[PDB]
UniProtKB/Swiss-Prot annotation, chain A:
Residues binding Zn(2+) 1, per UniProt: 56, 58, 71, 74
Cofactor(s) of this protein: Mg(2+); Zn(2+)
Annotated Mg(2+) binding sites: 446, 448, 450
GO molecular function: DNA binding; DNA-directed RNA polymerase activity; magnesium ion binding; zinc ion binding
Species of provenance: Escherichia coli O157:H7
Intrachain disulfide bonds: none
Positions that bind Zn(2+) 2: 800, 874, 881, 884
UniProt-listed InterPro entries: DNA-dir_RpoC_beta_prime, DNA-dir_RpoC_beta_prime_bact, RNA_pol_asu, RNA_pol_N, RNA_pol_Rpb1_1, RNA_pol_Rpb1_3, RNA_pol_Rpb1_3_sf, RNA_pol_Rpb1_4
Cofactor binding notes: Binds 1 Mg(2+) ion per subunit. Binds 2 Zn(2+) ions per subunit.
Classification via SMART domains: RPOLA_N (SM00663)
GO biological process: DNA-templated transcription
Catalytic activity: RNA(n) + a ribonucleoside 5'-triphosphate = RNA(n+1) + diphosphate
Protein name listed in UniProt: DNA-directed RNA polymerase subunit beta'
Swiss-Prot record, chain B:
Taxonomic placement: Bacteria, Pseudomonadati, Pseudomonadota, Gammaproteobacteria, Enterobacterales
Oligomeric and partner information: Interacts transiently with the RNA polymerase catalytic core formed by RpoA, RpoB, RpoC and RpoZ (2 alpha, 1 beta, 1 beta' and 1 omega subunit) to form the RNA polymerase holoenzyme that can initiate transcription. Identified in a complex containing RpoD, the RNA polymerase subunits RpoA, RpoB and RpoZ, CRP and DNA. Interacts with Rsd; this prevents interaction with the RNA polymerase catalytic core and with promoter DNA, and as a consequence, promotes transcription from promoters that require alternative sigma factors.
Function, as annotated: Sigma factors are initiation factors that promote the attachment of RNA polymerase to specific initiation sites and are then released. This sigma factor is the primary sigma factor during exponential growth. Preferentially transcribes genes associated with fast growth, such as ribosomal operons, other protein-synthesis related genes, rRNA- and tRNA-encoding genes and prfB.
Protein name: RNA polymerase sigma factor RpoD
Family membership noted in the UniProt record: Belongs to the sigma-70 factor family. RpoD/SigA subfamily.
Top-rank lineage group of the source organism: Bacteria
Swiss-Prot record, chain C:
Protein family membership: Belongs to the RNA polymerase beta chain family.
Recorded superkingdom: Bacteria
Protein name: DNA-directed RNA polymerase subunit beta
Record's subunit section: The RNAP catalytic core consists of 2 alpha, 1 beta, 1 beta' and 1 omega subunit. When a sigma factor is associated with the core the holoenzyme is formed, which can initiate transcription.
Function of the protein: DNA-dependent RNA polymerase catalyzes the transcription of DNA into RNA using the four ribonucleoside triphosphates as substrates.
Boundaries of the shown chain within the full protein: 349 to 398 of 1342
Length: 1337, 38, 50
């Protein structure tokens, strides 16, 4: 069985000769009584193989007396009956025909080769016109079409000296004529002549085709076909039912029609007819052929009596009911079952309820072997009927076996890895699996009708895999982010909040105990309040010594509950930690810190006991919701009366006709929103602390004892808006239009809706519901795409010895920190030695793990930037090291190599999203201020104003780490300078949000030069004031006389000389586009910082983001540094006269100046400086920038997207899929291989790592790096089988076939589909054994 | 851009019309002549 | 605008090009196009409003 690799190829004719047993004949099947095959047809036993034991069709030859005899009555043979499925017959052809995939798909492969278009070839091969096989007289030409009548002209003209024909035969002759060599050298040559772009591309295309056929050895004449295989029956069967009424394939008629039409054809070739019918028949032939190959491709599709079209061969390989997705990747399985699911509250972590008969059914051969071992059921039939008796020993044995035999657990959707688990069995008297409740989380499951299913660890390898990997102890932190996933959900947390609580009210205040035990004596004797602060001693511990506990006791005035709750503490911990009412977040950090500090099991056991005590006390705690908990505040009516009077006033205004309707819309909607807010304040203050309870004092209040509020405060259920829904008016309503309604709701659920109000609720209700139904497909589609890219990657290595990657800095901008740079680093490994602001204090030797000792040790330090051996900066051929990744989250340690990184990345990423679609500047506080890469000016007011748009202001703290960062317009007006100290709450910045200022940093007289009324401009003289200038019109409105003359008001000295840009020799006057209208007159002065002019006025988003979708409106960038001016004057678009400092000027491109410009016609930029506005292209960024810019860009982008919904995932998940979007770099020079072609950046980095190495200095070729859209990148891959499995398979088949492709079974998909072990993780070891075996031969 | 050879053959038989009632007898005459002359 | 755009010079050009969109490839005759057009919207059989 065992084999190394696979290889595609064309089927040569002699290959079917080499596969064949017999040409076929008449198509009939059986005798309407004797339901038995006829011969040389479709179910002929003779050639595919025999049906029964050693019998001919009549029964003449049998018994092995006639061992090898073929029956001379029927020509029927003697053998076993398995070879049916390995053999294939064949059929010879009366004509030749061509294969369709080499025709009809994009680039033709055949006329492509020939430089003859398709429809030409059609018109030949629909048999409607002839065409020159060969210009015998070169008077006519090879590849020359000659109509049925023009052919005649040439015919009676010449006769002999041409070959000019029609049909597959002519094409055979031609392809058989043409050489590969001469064309190939001549193509390579005359490329040199004019390698114009489309031309050169086409040259390359055909050249490749040529040398491909050369080197594969595949032949073009074998494109044409004269023998065709045949399929065996049982893939196309014919089978009965009770009525003697059968069932058949979609296919058998295809062969039936085909063979019959051949029969007709040959029959009519015996007879020397006109070729008209010959044509008609053979067109029916090719019809039947290519419809077999693809029914519903070419013509009106073919149906039976069904009127459903008939399934092609191709269809069976294709879509989801294609093989790959239907029965090769997902599969029915033996030894499994399913169930409704209920809880086991009392259970332990490892345990799972198990309806015993399920295991009974499932653990059959175990106990049968066990009874032959015991011999009570000596034989097996005895075992069956004894099983059937229900002997108690059956169950004794079954408990005996089921011990330590672990099991699997499956809910659907198994969206991420934790949607299935593996527990130990425990049996139960019922048909209802129990489970440990807390893990509804990972399943997102609930006891409302959900279901689950099971699978069996038969092999011990699976047994142990299970027990070590999917034992629940293993996996309790998410691998995506570092939180526990066993958060105690709703009731437990609440009973907890009840206990650990501090009334003043109940009783028993200000006494002393030795420890919590006698408080239990009280409380279980029922003597003290439990949520009641009272003095007592404790004795806690701490491992302050080198992992050695530090014992001591002392007092606390603590609640009785908290005192008791200490009792479970495992011996490391303070009492301060247990000094509050323990928000759900609190419990999270509890379990966190326990695991962080001790290890797993104390936290485990702690957790179980916590669940248990929660059950106990929340059963004790007393809990109900009712109608008197539901309280509405009183001061609500007259607020609504105020609203009524005010809307009546605004009604009177709109009646009067002063105020408009949309104004009024915003007015009314805002004031209703304010009313809702006031009601919210009312109800919250009237509920949360509504409770006045007195202890040894007149009056005092504390947190409420109402059920509803404590449900809200625990985070178990409820929320302030939800309580508003039941109690208050809940906001307002958007109709399905997307509008928002003017009259919100008045009453609540407590009072009772209106007819209309609920009728109105309906709209947005159904809206959100259809969204509930219909956002998920996006997620699954997305998900399988993502993983389809990224399976191939697994850790290669431990250290790649590589060099620095990207820098790490926090994301605090807009407000405060949004990822602590602490948190950014977490588990990562440096790029380099790294020091402290106390300088020259290195702590990594270029790389260490960075654990919370380091994280806090350097949170002390005010360092705020570090670099890391990046995911992408890694350089291993075929994968990576482990260092460049760092730490396993869900473990909590550096990965040991050999595990799939892509899969968990996508499960991290796409799992959550299912839910997740659903002027001036003002300092807040005091601190230093930083503005860099800045050219600005002390304006005429005495403050800084920008001349370099790149600048943005920051609020730096007094230390130096930024508090805020905010953009600032070009030439905006400040009240402050850089690197100063200024009070919080101050509007430093100001600008008209419509102006785009034209500040003059030169100071000087102004004169009306270059510019004339109505010519380049208008002259508008303000009716308002009296002071104006020459008033510049827009692109269109100026009269075209001076629209080819860039208008420029001009600055000069007294002498009329242009005031140079001070310090530079560049003159300083402004070429004015529209809206830059100046306020001063001729002869007047501007100063430094003086405006001459003022210039007035989602989920699929992320789909576009990672797809590398490239927008419609680029905010384009400076291709190269140096000065620039504008280009040709708008034949559709204007252009851009580049002028480098020292390079070459000519590069210009179209500009829509209908979309605003940023730079002006005498203004300089640096390369990579933005020029237009809108969105931009990342492709340009990579084309211009390196890696870190764009990398950082999109990671920040989409992390902000999901962090809107408050969703936390680490970066490397993102960093890694990027490198799979860069599997290719396009070449620059040549000499190694061909000139440019997009080739593996990996293999590029090899050949340069060999060829530019001492092989040469360089023969080879520089390159540029290439992006690929994920869905195309996937396809654009070495392996084809993966590429055959998900999308656009057919063309992939062809493209592999043409070239003699040969896969090598490295990928996950590749080695799964073959039924081999993984080349990674578990079978990593075995596979690398195979690796160094092949190394070892 | 017709793909249906139904059209092709109804058109191309459309070339030829019906020839009758002496052509019936005149093909017959040429052929019985050819027969008697073999 | 449409009329200057309309090339069909006589009524019969209209009848036949209407036929030809209705019957592309097919050689037009008079009664073919005539009976055709009336069958489409002027025959009680193949057409009713209810
Ligand atoms: Mg459910
Ligand atoms: Zn026989
Ligand atoms: Zn690495």
């Amino acid at each position: 069985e065992e084999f190394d690799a696979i290889k595609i190829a064309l089927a040569s004719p002699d290959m079917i000769r080499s596969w064949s047993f017999g040409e076929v004949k008449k198509p009939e099947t059986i005798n309407y009584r004797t339901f038995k095959p006829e011969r040389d047809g479709l179910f002929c036993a003779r050639i595919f193989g025999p049906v029964k034991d050693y019998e001919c069709l009549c029964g003449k030859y049998k018994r092995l007396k006639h061992r090898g005899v073929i029956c001379e009555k029927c020509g029927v043979e003697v053998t076993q009956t398995k070879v049916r499925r390995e053999r294939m017959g064949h059929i010879e052809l009366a004509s030749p025909t061509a294969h369709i995939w080499f025709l009809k798909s994009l680039p033709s492969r055949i006329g492509l080769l020939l430089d003859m278009p398709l429809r030409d070839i059609e018109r030949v091969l629909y048999f409607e016109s002839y065409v020159v096989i060969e210009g015998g007289m070169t008077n006519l030409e090879r590849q020359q079409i000659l109509t049925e009548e023009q052919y005649l002209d040439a015919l009676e003209e010449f006769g002999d000296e041409f070959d000019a024909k029609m049909g597959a035969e002519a094409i055979q002759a031609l392809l058989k004529s043409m050489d590969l060599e001469q064309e190939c050298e001549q193509l390579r040559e005359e490329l040199n002549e004019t390698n114009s772009e489309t031309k050169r591309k086409k040259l390359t295309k055909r050249i490749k085709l040529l040398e491909a056929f050369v080197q594969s050895g595949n032949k073009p004449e074998w494109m044409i076909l004269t023998v065709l295989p045949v399929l065996p029956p049982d893939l196309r069967p014919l089978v009965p039912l009770d009525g003697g009424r059968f069932a058949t394939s979609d296919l058998n008629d295809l062969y039936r029609r085909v063979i019959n039409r051949n029969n007709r054809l040959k029959r009519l070739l015996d007879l020397a007819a006109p070729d008209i019918i010959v044509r008609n028949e053979k067109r029916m032939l090719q019809e039947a052929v290519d419809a077999l190959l693809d029914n519903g491709r070419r013509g009106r599709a073919i149906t039976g009596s069904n009127k459903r079209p008939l399934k092609s061969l191709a269809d069976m390989i294709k879509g989801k009911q294609g093989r790959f997705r239907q029965n090769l990747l997902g599969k029915r399985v033996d030894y499994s079952g399913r169930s409704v699911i209920t809880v086991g509250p009392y259970l332990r972590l490892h345990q799972c309820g198990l309806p015993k008969k399920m295991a009974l059914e499932l653990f059959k051969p175990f106990i049968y072997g066990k009874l032959e071992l015991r011999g009570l059921a000596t034989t097996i039939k005895a075992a069956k009927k004894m099983v059937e008796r229900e002997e108690a020993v059956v169950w004794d044995i079954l408990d005996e076996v089921i011990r330590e035999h672990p099991v699997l657990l499956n809910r659907a959707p198994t969206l991420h890895r934790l949607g299935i688990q593996a527990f130990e069995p425990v049996l139960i008297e019922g048909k209802a699996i129990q489970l440990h409740p807390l893990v509804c989380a990972a399943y997102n499951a609930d006891f409302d009708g959900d279901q689950m299913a099971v699978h069996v660890p038969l092999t011990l390898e699976a047994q142990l895999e299970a027990r070590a990997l999917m034992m629940s102890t293993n996996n309790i932190l998410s691998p995506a982010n570092g939180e526990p996933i066993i958060v105690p959900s709703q009731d437990v947390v609440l009973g907890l909040y009840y206990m650990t609580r501090d009334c003043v009210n109940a009783k028993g205040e200000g006494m002393v105990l030795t420890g919590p035990k006698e408080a239990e004596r009280l409380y279980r004797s029922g003597l003290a309040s439990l949520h009641a602060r009272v003095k007592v001693r404790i004795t806690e511990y701490e491992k302050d010594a080198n992992g050695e506990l530090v014992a001591k006791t002392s007092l606390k005035d603590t609640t009785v509950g908290r005192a008791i709750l200490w009792m479970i503490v495992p011996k490391g911990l303070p009492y301060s930690i247990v000094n509050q009412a323990l928000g759900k977040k609190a419990i999270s950090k509890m379990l966190n810190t326990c695991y962080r500090i001790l290890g797993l099991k104390p936290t485990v056991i702690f957790a179980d006991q916590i669940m248990y005590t929660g059950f106990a006390y929340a059963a004790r705690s007393g809990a109900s919701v009712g109608i008197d908990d539901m309280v509405i505040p009183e001061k609500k009516h007259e607020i609504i009366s105020e609203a009524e009077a005010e809307v009546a006033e605004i009604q009177e205004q709109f009646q009067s006709g002063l105020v408009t309707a949309g104004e009024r819309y915003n007015k009314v909607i805002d004031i209703w929103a304010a009313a809702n807010d006031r009601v919210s304040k009312a109800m919250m203050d009237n509920l949360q602390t509504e409770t006045v309870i007195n202890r040894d004092g007149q009056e005092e209040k504390q947190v409420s004892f109402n059920s509803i509020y404590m449900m809200a405060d625990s985070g178990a259920r409820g929320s302030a808006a939800q309580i508003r829904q039941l109690a208050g008016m809940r906001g307002l309503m958007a109709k399905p239009d997307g509008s928002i309604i003017e009259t919100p709701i008045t009453a609540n659920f407590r009072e009772g809706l209106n007819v209309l109000q609920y009728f109105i609720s309906t709209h947005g209700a159904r809206k959100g519901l259809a969204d509930t139904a219909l956002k998920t497909a996006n997620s699954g589609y997305l998900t399988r795409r993502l993983v389809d890219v990224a399976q191939d990657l697994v850790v290669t290595e431990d250290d790649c010895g590589t060099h620095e990657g990207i820098m790490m800095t926090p994301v605090i901008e807009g407000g405060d920190v949004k990822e602590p740079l602490r948190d950014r680093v977490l588990g990562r490994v440096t790029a380099e030695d790294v020091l402290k602001p106390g300088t020259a204090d290195i702590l990594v030797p270029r790389n260490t793990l960075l654990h919370e000792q380091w994280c806090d040790l350097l949170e002390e330090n005010s360092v705020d930037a570090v670099k890391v051996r990046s995911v992408v900066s890694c350089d291993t051929d075929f994968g990576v090291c482990a260092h460049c990744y760092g730490r396993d989250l869900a473990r909590g340690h550096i990965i040991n190599k050999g595990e799939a990184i892509g899969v968990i990345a996508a499960q991290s990423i796409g799992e959550p999203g299912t839910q997740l679609t659903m002027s001036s500047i003002q300092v807040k506080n005091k601190g230093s201020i930083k503005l860099s890469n800045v050219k600005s000016v002390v304006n005429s007011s005495g403050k800084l104003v920008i001349t370099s748009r790149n600048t943005e202001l920051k609020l730096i703290d007094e230390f130096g780490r930024t508090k805020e960062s905010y953009k600032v317009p070009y030439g905006a007006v400040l009240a402050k300078g850089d690197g100063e100290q200024v009070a919080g709450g101050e509007t430093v910045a100001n600008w008209d949000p419509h102006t785009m200022p034209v500040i003059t940093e030169v100071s000087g007289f102004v004169r009306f030069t270059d510019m004339i009324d109505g010519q380049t401009i208008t002259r508008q003289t303000d009716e308002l004031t009296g002071l104006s200038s020459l008033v510049v019109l827009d692109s269109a409105e100026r009269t075209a006389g001076g629209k080819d003359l860039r208008p420029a008001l001009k600055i000069v000295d007294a002498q009329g000389n242009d005031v140079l840009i001070p310090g530079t020799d560049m003159p300083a006057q402004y070429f004015l586009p529209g809206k830059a209208i100046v306020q001063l007159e001729d002869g007047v002065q501007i100063s430094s910082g003086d405006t001459l002019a003022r210039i007035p006025q989602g989920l699929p988003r992320v789909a576009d983001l990672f797809e590398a979708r490239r927008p419609k409106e680029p905010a384009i960038l400076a291709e190269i540094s140096g000065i620039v001016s504008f280009g040709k004057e708008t034949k559709g678009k204007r252009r851009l006269v580049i002028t480098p400092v020292d390079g070459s000027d000519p590069y210009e491109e179209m500009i829509p100046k209908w979309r605003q410009l940023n730079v002006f016609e005498g203004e300089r930029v640096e390369r990579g400086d933005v020029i237009s506005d809108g969105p931009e292209a990342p492709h340009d960024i990579l084309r211009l920038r390196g890696v870190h810019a764009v990398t950082r860009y999109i990671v920040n982008e989409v992390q902000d997207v999901y962090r809107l919904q408050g969703v936390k995932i680490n970066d490397k998940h993102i960093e890694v899929i990027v490198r799979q979007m860069l599997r290719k770099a396009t070449i620059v020079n040549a000499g190694s291989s061909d000139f440019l072609e997009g080739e593996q950046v990996e293999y590029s980095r090899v050949k340069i790592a060999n060829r530019e190495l001492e092989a040469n200095g360089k023969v080879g070729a520089t390159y540029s790096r290439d992006l690929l859209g994920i869905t195309k990148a996937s396809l654009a891959t070495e392996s084809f089988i993966s590429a055959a499995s998900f999308q656009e398979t057919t063309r992939v088949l062809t493209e592999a076939a043409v070239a003699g492709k040969r896969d090598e079974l490295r990928g996950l998909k590749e080695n799964v589909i073959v039924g081999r072990l993984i080349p990674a993780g578990t079978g990593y070891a075995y596979h690398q054994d195979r690796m160094r075996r092949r190394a070892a031969g | 851009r017709t793909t249906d050879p139904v059209r092709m053959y109804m058109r191309e038989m459309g070339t030829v019309e019906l020839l009758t009632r002496e052509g019936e007898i005149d093909i017959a005459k040429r052929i019985e002549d050819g027969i008697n002359q073999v | 605008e449409t009329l200057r755009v309309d090339p069909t010079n006589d009524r019969l050009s209209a009848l036949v090009e209407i036929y030809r969109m209705m019957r592309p490839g097919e050689p037009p005759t008079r009664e073919a196009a005539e009976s055709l057009f009336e069958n489409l919207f002027f025959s009680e059989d193949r057409y009713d409003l209810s």
